[PDB]
Amino acid sequence: MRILMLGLDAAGKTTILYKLKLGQSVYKNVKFNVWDVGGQDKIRPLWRHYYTGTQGLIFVVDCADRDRIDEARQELHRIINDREMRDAIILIFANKQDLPDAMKPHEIQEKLGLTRIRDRNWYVQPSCATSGDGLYEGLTWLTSNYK
Ligand SMILES: Nc1nc2c(ncn2[C@@H]2O[C@H](COP(=O)(O)OP(=O)(O)O)[C@@H](O)[C@H]2O)c(=O)[nH]1
Ligand SMILES: [Cl-]
Ligand SMILES: [Cl-]
């Protein structure tokens, strides 16, 4: 399965990738690409990325970062609307659930406008990337929904 992992900078993408790696004993067919979106995107606004071949999207959100949730919402909807992304299965990692007063998954659903995503499979997984909680649960949802 070809999975794209996106999120604003500091969402926890690097941490999830190293923690998922640490969980493997000492998902063989999963391929991952990863980059930052939003104001700290290396390419926007002068060029677009290309999303060819993407089967699954993992969108990582810092749930304690209310100041940037609107920017995360705008990036998510812009990406999923690209021609090459119209069939992509969407996993949202609602990251940093360990932090006091972090936004819970139902608030994430509302703040990301997920209810307006029709004719496409999506799921919100609560996670704490530093402890590894919810990471395999999210990756299992994504890969099982792909089959
Ligand atoms: N409290 C807490 N910190 C996290 C969690 N996930 C990542 N971090 C921290 O948030 C910061 C940015 O994470 P990083 O993985 O580098 O984000 P990236 O820019 O999206 O790759 C780092 O200091 C991570 O330790 C989490 O679940 N809880
Ligand atoms: Cl783009
Ligand atoms: Cl454009």
Side-chain angles (χ1 to χ4, degrees):
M1 184 179 189
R2 290 178 296 267
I3 303 174
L4 182 56
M5 183 187 278
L6 302 182
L8 298 176
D9 61 296
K13 296 178 306 296
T14 304
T15 311
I16 288 163
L17 293 161
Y18 73 77
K19 204 66 179 176
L20 282 169
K21 176 189 169 184
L22 274 153
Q24 286 299 135
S25 58
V26 295
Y27 305 89
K28 197 186 158 287
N29 295 5
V30 165
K31 290 179 186 186
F32 287 117
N33 291 346
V34 57
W35 65 78
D36 293 332
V37 302
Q40 304 291 91
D41 187 309
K42 299 179 184 168
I43 284 146
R44 295 297 289 161
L46 296 109
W47 299 275
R48 296 178 61 88
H49 291 99
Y50 60 100
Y51 301 96
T52 325
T54 303
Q55 296 173 303
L57 166 70
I58 295 177
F59 198 89
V60 182
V61 303
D62 175 345
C63 293
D65 196 5
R66 286 168 172 90
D67 293 12
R68 291 200 294 164
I69 198 68
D70 294 22
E71 184 172 21
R73 173 186 190 154
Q74 299 181 9
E75 278 297 294
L76 177 62
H77 288 282
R78 193 183 68 77
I79 290 154
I80 68 176
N81 286 116
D82 186 90
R83 190 208 188 228
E84 296 290 338
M85 292 295 286
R86 291 170 196 160
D87 286 353
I89 298 147
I90 306 153
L91 168 68
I92 308 295
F93 268 125
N95 197 223
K96 314 198 179 171
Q97 290 300 315
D98 61 302
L99 294 172
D101 202 73
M103 293 175 279
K104 307 274 190 74
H106 286 111
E107 176 154 23
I108 292 300
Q109 161 192 37
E110 183 189 357
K111 299 263 190 292
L112 290 181
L114 307 177
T115 61
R116 74 214 179 143
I117 298 171
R118 52 189 156 178
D119 326 319
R120 18 197 340 179
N121 299 20
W122 61 264
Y123 186 74
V124 179
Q125 173 70 53
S127 66
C128 167
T130 54
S131 69
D133 307 323
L135 302 190
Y136 277 93
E137 295 77 359
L139 194 60
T140 310
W141 181 82
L142 190 55
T143 65
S144 303
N145 280 258
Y146 170 67
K147 290 97 84 187

